[PDB]
Design a protein around this ligand. Structure first.
Ligand SMILES: *[C@@H]1O[C@H](CO)[C@@H](O)[C@H](O)[C@H]1NC(C)=O
Ligand SMILES: OC[C@H]1O[C@@H](S)[C@H](O)[C@@H](O)[C@@H]1O
Ligand SMILES: OC[C@H]1O[C@@H](S)[C@H](O)[C@@H](O)[C@@H]1O
Ligand SMILES: OC[C@H]1O[C@@H](S)[C@H](O)[C@@H](O)[C@@H]1O
Ligand SMILES: OC[C@H]1O[C@@H](S)[C@H](O)[C@@H](O)[C@@H]1O
Ligand SMILES: OC[C@H]1O[C@H](O)[C@H](O)[C@@H](O)[C@@H]1O
Ligand SMILES: OC[C@H]1O[C@H](O)[C@H](O)[C@@H](O)[C@@H]1O
Ligand code: NI
Ligand code: NI
Length: 430
């Protein structure tokens, strides 16, 4: 896509800490940028909208390449339109923001400069952050995660992307998302189908695949930590059902693992570890520090709340695994007990570790779930299963919860606050 400037693009500042062996940390002057899908797109250098509602303009966008030549991305009013504000090392993402239109959530990337995403190499290192999930009810997901995106949003590989990282281009994840309007310097117009249940979104003929490490997908009720390997580490474009994922007739027909080797303490039999109030080890009405440590043998997790360190609880009642670590043993035992082969089919932890040994971009987001109402995270899922089915119970939310239209009307002032990001070698951030 091109760049237009009727709305200025200024990346909100966000400080974070880089820590080194010894425990010394220094402040880093980062910024955040909104993902390109959220932007107004119109004719370059001016003219009609190229996309409006959930349909493309056929005149401006008769095919994928022409559309990218004729259409530009605009700047974003971060607070007024998208409900994104920063203060020092704190980032707030509001749920429903009404200005011209109703906007629901946002996806942001941490920047090293105004034209480059920050790239984190996770293996042998740890990532720590503080979060307030107190205003995240059933059906919402405040997510912090890593994806194997290009630092420049694809600009050097795809010269028809003139917007680059400055405008939040180049997203990919292990779902191989097809809802993206621009992928690899081309629009996603050919075969585009508008969503049945969402006036603002649709599903294109292409998706955008890459490795994904979901550090944190959570609300006040449940949380999950999930590696997703892909057969190619970095970004590749997929077509239709061969993207796999939720919007494809064969979930497992692609090159990425859309399921992941997920660790949700509730799903693994600990019903008192994480929840609202003093009945829970980690009280979701109060700030939580979440620390995640990556090594070749596995991923480890601890939490700090009110100065108290709590290690990840042991898996409880999971046949053949009594640890608290995402390692090859756990991932295999999970597949055996709960079903499925996707994670190991796509190379498992060995293949994930290849992405963890290269740069990944930090994503901070808030969303609700049109496909499955976040029931996979915080309720009983699938709907045909019940709490006696192995792996079915993931949280205490009602199976009727999380319908986007309902949560948007009932809980519009929901929000997530991420803060005090720290990164460095294992043992260095605490
Ligand atoms: C849940 O985790 C807590 C905190 O680690 C632990 O004390 C408790 O024993 C765990 N519950 C079960 C059923 O294992
Ligand atoms: O799609 C057009 C629409 O996009 C949104 S994102 C803009 O904020 C608005 O001004 C414009 O009319
Ligand atoms: O409303 C803000 C923004 O939302 C997204 S959903 C629209 O596609 C864009 O035109 C505008
Ligand atoms: O797509 C929804 C949800 O599906 C589950 S299977 C994945 O583990 C998670 O990362 C993703 O956000
Ligand atoms: O939660 C793990 C995984 O469960 C399966 S059953 C869901 O369909 C998917 O979105 C995710
Ligand atoms: O893809 C862009 C769209 O993303 C989300 O669905 C937002 O709720 C909407 O406002 C826009
Ligand atoms: O397709 C994904 C679903 O299938 C798996 O085998 C699991 O049992 C279920 O929790 C999910
Ligand atoms: Ni194609
Ligand atoms: Ni119980």
């Amino acid at each position: 896509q091109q760049v237009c400037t009727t709305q200025a693009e200024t990346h909100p500042a966000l400080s974070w800490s880089k820590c080194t062996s010894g425990g010394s940390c220094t402040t880093q002057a980062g910024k955040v940028v909104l993902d390109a899908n959220w932007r107004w797109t119109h004719a370059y250098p001016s003219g009609n909208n190229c996309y409006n509602g959930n349909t493309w303009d056929a005149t401006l966008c008769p095919d994928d390449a022409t559309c990218a030549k004729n259409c530009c991305l605009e700047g974003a009013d971060y607070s007024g339109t998208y409900g994104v504000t920063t203060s020092g090392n704190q980032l707030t993402i509001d749920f429903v923001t009404q200005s011209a239109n109703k906007n629901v959530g946002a996806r942001l990337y941490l920047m090293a400069s105004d034209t480059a995403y920050e790239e984190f190499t996770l293996l042998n290192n740890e990532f720590s952050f503080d979060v307030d999930v107190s205003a995240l009810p059933c059906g919402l997901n405040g997510a912090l995660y890593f994806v194997s995106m290009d630092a420049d949003g694809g600009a050097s590989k795809y010269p028809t992307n003139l917007a680059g990282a400055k405008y939040g281009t180049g997203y990919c994840d292990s779902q191989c998302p097809r809802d993206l309007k621009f992928i690899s310097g081309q629009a996603n117009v050919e075969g585009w189908q508008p969503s049945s249940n969402n006036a603002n979104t649709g599903i294109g003929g292409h998706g955008s695949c890459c490795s994904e490490m979901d550090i944190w997908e959570a609300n006040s009720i449940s949380q999950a930590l999930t590696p997703h390997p892909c057969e190619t580490v970095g970004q590749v474009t997929c077509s239709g059902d061969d993207c796999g994922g939720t919007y494809s007739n064969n979930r497992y027909g692609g090159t990425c693992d859309p399921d992941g080797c997920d660790w949700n303490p509730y799903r693994l039999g600990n019903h008192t570890f994480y929840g609202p109030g003093s009945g829970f080890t980690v009280d979701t009405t109060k700030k939580i520090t979440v620390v995640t440590q990556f090594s070749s043998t596995g991923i480890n997790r601890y939490y700090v709340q009110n100065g108290v360190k709590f290690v990840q609880p042991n898996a409880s009642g999971l046949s053949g695994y009594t640890g608290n670590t995402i390692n090859s043993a756990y991932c295999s035992a999970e597949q055996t007990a709960f079903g499925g082969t996707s994670f190991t089919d796509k190379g498992g932890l060995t293949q994930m570790n290849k992405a963890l040994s290269g740069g990944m971009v930090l994503v901070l987001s808030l969303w609700d779930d049109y496909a499955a109402n976040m029931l996979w995270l915080d309720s009983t899922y699938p709907t045909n299963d019940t709490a006696s089915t192995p792996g079915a119970a993931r949280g205490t939310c009602s199976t009727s919860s999380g319908v986007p239209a309902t949560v948007e009307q009932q809980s519009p002032n929901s929000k997530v606050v991420f803060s005090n990001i720290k990164f460095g070698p294992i043992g260095s951030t605490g």
